[PDB]
Design a protein around this ligand. Structure first.
Ligand code: ATP
Length: 311
DNA sequence: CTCCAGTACAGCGCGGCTGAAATCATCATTAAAGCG
């Protein structure tokens, strides 16, 4: 098995230009906010499985590895909002995250704000990052709760720490609720999936950078004339499912004697990870499924919005 | 301060009533054909 090759095949990262555009903007946000005056407050979108958490873990690596190895400073922070977040609920988890506090046996929402606003200059927080903004909409109706939104405006105007919010593409109507939240968050971006399969894409260079990143030491055989056809036939532009199927083929090749990912084990990888796909999506690998041109069609605009049509 | 209970307020769903539209009855009127 040689589990080093397995973990080294799973932990692989390809920097598409949108990702480095993002990380450049967050360093821009980090040492552009001067902690004297009003911050910049970027907002990042992206659908399910487009690489968001990988982006922020890249960011806390390249921004906080040496400063977390040096001492208890914690300049950048990483937060997910729990579902249907009460303002005291999000505030207390954001508080027990940073520092070494006890911090949550009292739930009073004024005095823990006191403790968090005295601690946010005490350890020297350079940036606060929130992962999951779509948790503030109701399940069965599309009312949105902005107790946490006005609380986040309060902690923004209290201490001038920059905030970078990630979230689903349907989570922006929450920002359409509070207009002061809408104006305070100026930079919204678009981390949409891979666009086309027609040729000379960013998809190409991503694919062959992943190919040299793979643990097989000669060639992976991928990013070819017909392979990206069935690859884009399998995953829409969907980064998580593409990488998942690729990893599930790579483990199958390293289970036995195999020199590269080839045409006997990539099929069984299509057999496993075909579960999340819809019924009208077509299964292209086993016996005779040639792929029409309409099925490599680019992803629509409401690609991170199908959590929202039904209600 | 937190959990449980009571009680108010708000919301959704179901049922009943009312209104409108569609269909069927019902006959009435008009026209054509046959008989006187
Ligand atoms: N730049 C990249 N290069 C290689 N693989 C990547 C890249 N970005 C993401 N992946 C793969 O995609 C998978 C999904 O990553 P991630 O969870 O960050 O997406 P996401 O949009 O945050 O999904 P969710 O929002 O549901 O957490 C990861 O397992 C990772 O291996």
């Amino acid at each position: 098995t040689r589990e080093a090759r397995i973990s080294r095949a799973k932990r692989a990262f390809v920097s598409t230009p949108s990702v480095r555009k993002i990380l450049s903007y967050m360093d821009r946000c980090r040492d552009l906010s001067d902690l004297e005056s009003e911050p910049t407050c970027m907002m990042v979108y992206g659908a399910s499985g487009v690489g968001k958490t990988t982006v922020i873990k890249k960011y806390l690596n390249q921004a906080a590895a040496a400063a977390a190895a040096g001492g208890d400073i914690i300049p950048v922070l990483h937060i997910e909002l729990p579902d249907n977040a009460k303002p005291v609920d999000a505030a207390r988890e954001l508080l027990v995250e940073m520092g070494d506090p006890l911090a949550l046996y009292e739930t009073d929402l004024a005095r823990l704000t006191k403790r968090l606003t005295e601690l946010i200059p005490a350890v020297g927080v350079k940036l606060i990052i929130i992962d999951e903004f779509q948790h503030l909409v109701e399940e069965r109706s599309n009312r949105v709760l902005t107790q946490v939104g006005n609380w986040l405006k309060m902690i923004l105007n209290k201490t001038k720490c920059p905030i970078v919010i990630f979230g689903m593409p349907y989570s922006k109507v929450v920002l359409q609720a509070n207009s002061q939240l809408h104006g305070r968050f100026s930079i919204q971006v678009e981390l949409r999936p891979f666009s086309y399969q027609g040729g000379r894409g960013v998809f190409k260079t991503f694919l062959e950078y992943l190919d040299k990143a793979l643990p097989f030491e000669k060639q992976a055989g991928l990013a070819n004339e017909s392979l990206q056809k069935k690859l884009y036939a399998f995953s829409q532009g969907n980064m998580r499912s593409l990488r998942n199927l690729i990893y599930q083929a790579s483990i199958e090749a390293i289970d036995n004697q195999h020199e590269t990912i080839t045409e006997e084990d990539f099929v069984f990888a299509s057999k496993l990870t075909s579960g999340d796909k819809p019924n009208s999506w077509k299964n292209p690998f086993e016996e005779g499924v040639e792929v029409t041109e309409d099925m490599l069609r680019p992803p629509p605009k409401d690609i991170g919005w199908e959590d929202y049509l039904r209600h």
